[PDB]
């Protein structure tokens, strides 16, 4: 029942992203994507179904603080006995300070500084691939990860930070 807490958290997370993107950005499954997502590999894929849904818009900053929204949301809606496990997944995924009561602000500072980096915001390769290191699954049950696409390099940046924090929990 330990796995199911996380898997549910990841499916809750995906829902909140594909929603907060159409509600807090003008995103639609049929909108055009400035940058498409050609391929999604996992280096060590031990039971993680990988899917790429394009939910693209044009306002990247909204795409960004909207995905910020989904994360802070899926965080506090968790048990504080579970929100207690996020600080490690921070250092594990992003080699950054932990904390269970200031972590929403830690992710914010990172993405507001990384996804806002030129090397990130200014790379606009129309076909970009996405690659994660390790991702795991419950013995009978696959972790189902959807790489929602935004189209703008900024947006897809924030998506990937979360995918780190999400694939860094699947370690269990």
């Amino acid at each position, epitope marked *: 029942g330990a796995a199911a807490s996380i898997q549910t958290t990841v499916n809750t997370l995906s829902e909140r992203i594909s929603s907060k993107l159409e509600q807090e950005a003008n995103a639609s499954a049929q909108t055009k994507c400035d940058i498409e*997502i*050609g*391929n999604f*590999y996992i*280096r060590q894929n031990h039971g993680c179904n990988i899917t790429v849904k394009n939910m693209c818009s044009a306002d990247a900053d909204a795409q960004l603080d909207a995905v910020l929204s989904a994360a802070t949301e899926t965080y506090s809606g968790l048990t504080p006995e579970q929100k207690a496990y996020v600080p490690a997944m921070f*250092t*594990a*995924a*992003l*080699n950054i300070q932990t904390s269970v009561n200031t972590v929403v602000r830690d992710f914010e500072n990172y993405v507001k500084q990384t996804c806002n*980096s*030129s*090397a*990130v915001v*200014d*790379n*606009k*390769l*129309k*076909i*970009q*691939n*996405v*690659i*994660i*290191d390790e991702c795991y699954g419950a013995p009978g049950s696959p972790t189902n990860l959807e790489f929602i696409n935004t189209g703008s*390099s900024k947006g*897809n*940046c924030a998506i*990937k*930070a979360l995918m*780190q924090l999400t694939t860094k929990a699947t370690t269990q």
Partner: nanobody
Framework: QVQLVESGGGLVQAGGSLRLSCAAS????????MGWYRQAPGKEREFVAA????????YYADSVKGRFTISRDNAKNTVYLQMNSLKPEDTAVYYC????????????????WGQGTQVTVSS
């Protein structure tokens, strides 16, 4: 175990040309979108060029478009930055690294960044 290595740089008079190379070892390169980036003294890093894994899609920063050309040899596991019409404003440490969305671990991002080769274009 993943090592990128960048070579080809030096001193060339403005309006000159240089071919920059990046040897790749440690991973399946043909799988990897790659980029050239640069960092000058005082300025933060700047995106310059981007190649698709295969090499069919590319992208260039607005201040190098037309004068720069990124490329790859998936047989030799190498990325080239053909640099023409250089300007003293291109003087910098140049880095082939992995495209960000295509970095496996954001906690060890440095492993997908080379150490650099320098280019001093003079008046």
């Amino acid at each position: 175990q993943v090592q990128l290595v960048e070579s080809g740089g030096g001193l060339v008079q403005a309006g000159g040309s240089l071919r920059l190379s990046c040897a790749a070892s440690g991973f399946i390169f043909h799988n990897f979108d790659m980029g050239w980036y640069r960092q000058a003294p005082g300025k933060e890093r700047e995106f310059v060029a981007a190649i698709s894994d295969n090499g069919r899609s590319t992208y260039y920063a607005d201040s190098v478009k037309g004068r720069f050309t990124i490329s790859r040899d998936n047989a030799k596991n190498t990325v080239y930055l053909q640099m023409n019409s250089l300007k003293p404003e291109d003087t910098a440490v140049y880095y082939c690294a992995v495209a960000w969305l295509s970095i496996p671990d954001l906690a060890e991002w440095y492993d997908y960044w080379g150490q650099g080769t320098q280019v001093t274009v003079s008046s």
